Design a protein around this ligand. Sequence first.
Ligand SMILES: *[C@@H]1O[C@H](CO)[C@@H](O)[C@H](O)[C@H]1NC(C)=O
Ligand SMILES: *[C@@H]1O[C@H](CO)[C@@H](O)[C@H](O)[C@H]1NC(C)=O
Ligand SMILES: *[C@@H]1O[C@H](CO)[C@@H](O)[C@H](O)[C@H]1NC(C)=O
Ligand SMILES: *[C@@H]1O[C@H](CO)[C@@H](O)[C@H](O)[C@H]1NC(C)=O
Lengths: 434, 434
Amino acid sequence: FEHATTVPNVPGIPYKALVERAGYAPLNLEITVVSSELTPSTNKEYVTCKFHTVVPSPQVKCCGSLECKASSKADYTCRVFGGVYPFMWGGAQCFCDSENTQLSEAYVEFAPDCTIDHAVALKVHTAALKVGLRIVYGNTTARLDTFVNGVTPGSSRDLKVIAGPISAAFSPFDHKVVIRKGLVYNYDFPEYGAMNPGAFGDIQASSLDATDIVARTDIRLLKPSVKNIHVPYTQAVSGYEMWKNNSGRPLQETAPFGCKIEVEPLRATNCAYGHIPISIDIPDAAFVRSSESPTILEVSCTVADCIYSADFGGSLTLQYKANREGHCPVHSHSTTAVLKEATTHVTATGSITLHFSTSSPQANFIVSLCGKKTTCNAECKPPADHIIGEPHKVDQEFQAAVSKTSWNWLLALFGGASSLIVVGLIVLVCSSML
Amino acid sequence: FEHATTVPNVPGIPYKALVERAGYAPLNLEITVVSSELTPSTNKEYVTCKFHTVVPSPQVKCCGSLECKASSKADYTCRVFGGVYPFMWGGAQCFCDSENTQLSEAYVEFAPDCTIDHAVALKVHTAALKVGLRIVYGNTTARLDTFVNGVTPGSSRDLKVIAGPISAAFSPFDHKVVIRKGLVYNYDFPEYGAMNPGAFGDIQASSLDATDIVARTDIRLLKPSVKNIHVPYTQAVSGYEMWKNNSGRPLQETAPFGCKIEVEPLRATNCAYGHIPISIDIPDAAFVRSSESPTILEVSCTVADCIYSADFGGSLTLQYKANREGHCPVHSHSTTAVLKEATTHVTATGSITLHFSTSSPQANFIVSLCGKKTTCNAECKPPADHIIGEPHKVDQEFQAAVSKTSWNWLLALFGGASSLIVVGLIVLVCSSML
Ligand SMILES: *[C@@H]1O[C@H](CO)[C@@H](O)[C@H](O)[C@H]1NC(C)=O
Ligand SMILES: *[C@@H]1O[C@H](CO)[C@@H](O)[C@H](O)[C@H]1NC(C)=O
Ligand SMILES: *[C@@H]1O[C@H](CO)[C@@H](O)[C@H](O)[C@H]1NC(C)=O
Ligand SMILES: *[C@@H]1O[C@H](CO)[C@@H](O)[C@H](O)[C@H]1NC(C)=O
């Protein structure tokens, strides 16, 4: 037998269902989303960190003018100064006091402590959720991990589970993200080659140890104003440091739908943003014949102090009478109230209490003790507590959320208005035929 | 100096331009696309090959029965055979001739030659184009590589050029591709875990050496008929070899805009499909003063035997009245005709010749001989050769594709009909005032 149903993406919060077969007994169906993960397909655009702005020794030639050729090093800024008189310790460094040439060289490199402190720029594509499911059908508890794609038959034991395509995906990661020390940022980093100075991506490379290092940080070499040797240079502030100053908050503190963000690999776990269409191929071994199932005669609901809340507020007792011994499932067919229990060992002519939760002010739903569908009615008071530490077990649907007294009052006013309108029109009609 | 232009994406057939400042004279601009490549972002979604379907030794236990536990091996299928009596060399194997048990196991595994004969199933996303550009200005020729995103400063030794966003990338690779032995295919392979027997992807892994191999080939174990110790099994045929049977043609042979597909990395080179906006910053070291540039006083043009074709057919001769020896550029200011040469040596009051190609029967265009403009008129013939081995240097527009003689006849008829209608209406006007 194949049962196709729809489960909310909330972690925990067990989902009830009834499996009714024409040739077998109804079966309790439990579906719990124990965990989920939204893993995007990512690629490494580049990696960046603080630079080193290492400066080589100046090249001095005296009565001779020399030029410097191009180099493949990042930020290869090279300047030529004439008329310099270099002077280290001991004495003047050379001769030709009026005619010299000092060559000053500058090029950036990754800082030595960039193996730890480095930001990797990733491009994020579409993400496919992988859901961890637990099914407690017919005293058989199967734990499985399956992909939400609609084509993958991934399940354990003889059970088979296909999770259909998700109702809607929101992609918490933007198309460009930045990962640093386990922190994820939705930052629009510049592309490879596109390199603003003094901001993020000022120095780039394909890998940390890659020799193809590129940068466009503004290095300006200046003429030495003191009669010594050195390379005076003005440089833009490190854009990695400026980004770390103004990084904002990581995605772990701003992800919608309560997504908990991890890296290696990048993923969003324990999200809740929609409904999974799931098809389950239940084995025939767990199914029990209707002849062996106790066919129950008559039941009735009597509710005791129901409170509509996120908690299991409300305990109703069922008055039943059954032909023989044996257990049978319980289920609430309405999508408004949920029942805590799933199987009771009913015996004969007694009463069993069950705790239930609901959201609507009025509790009209269907209890299916041994499959005996019975409509149950109750009046529930608003909860006294304001904030609760556990999530709601059912979503409002805005048709039963209107209370019975309010429903009756609205239909009373519209019925009275329509009645006076119709009697006005029929007075017009009978005056017209006169 | 920022010059904005829009060059064709076609490799070869170089693009001519004239850059003219207010006061630093005209200068040539020779923009050549020597190479291009589309390198899309891909991720390994699985790898597949033939399976070995290694069958382990049977486990025969007697005077009893045993069951086998499920394993994590790829496509594990195990069965229990009752009432066997094996005969390998030496006679019967054990006691309870009527009560025996044979345990048969079967699982698949990559073939020993899967290191080469393997198909990598990849998901492909949007691609970024990268151009090799040969830019000639003055006497300087520079070769330089630029990404096509409008943001990346592709630079020569001294040049700053930006390749703007492409008109419309066509993406020859679909969302799913398969790479085998250097041949790529646009194949809609099943996802991870979505195995089916007798089709591509029936065995899957993240790598050739990955232990987590999963497969769902239709394998079944059968009861042995002859009383020996073999394991009779029957399995569905390998969908890898079935896919190689009818893979169709690779993308190297079936690709729009006819461009060469390579692997490692997966790229599409020399794809002529559009127009690249180019904003180039010409250095001022080549912008000569207008006074030093030898200007001309009187310019006249003629043309002999214009043949419109992809080849540079047509010789156009200019009579000039220059005042100084030197050289200065030439350019055609029509999108319909393009000149062969860029700069011409000019002495004084002489005659020069140029070659050009056009796609219109009429050649009504503008030659800018060394600063100023001069119009030229012609009537070009269709070429004798039906097929030429080189692409066209210009496109076709509806205004130029109609010949001057045909333009005359068509407007002669249209204007005759229109003026005939207007003269009918004015005869109506003079009759109505009567
Ligand atoms: C299912 O579980 C209940 C509670 O443990 C047990 O008493 C009952 O016999 C079980 N039903 C079957 C059919 O095994
Ligand atoms: C950024 O740096 C400035 C100093 O320039 C400092 O005052 C400030 O706290 C830093 N952080 C933010 C978020 O502005
Ligand atoms: C370019 O070269 C020509 C001849 O090749 C020479 O006469 C001239 O000096 C050069 N002009 C410029 C502007 O570089
Ligand atoms: C497929 O393999 C069969 C052999 O069974 C062969 O006859 C046939 O030509 C192959 N190709 C196609 C397209 O069927």
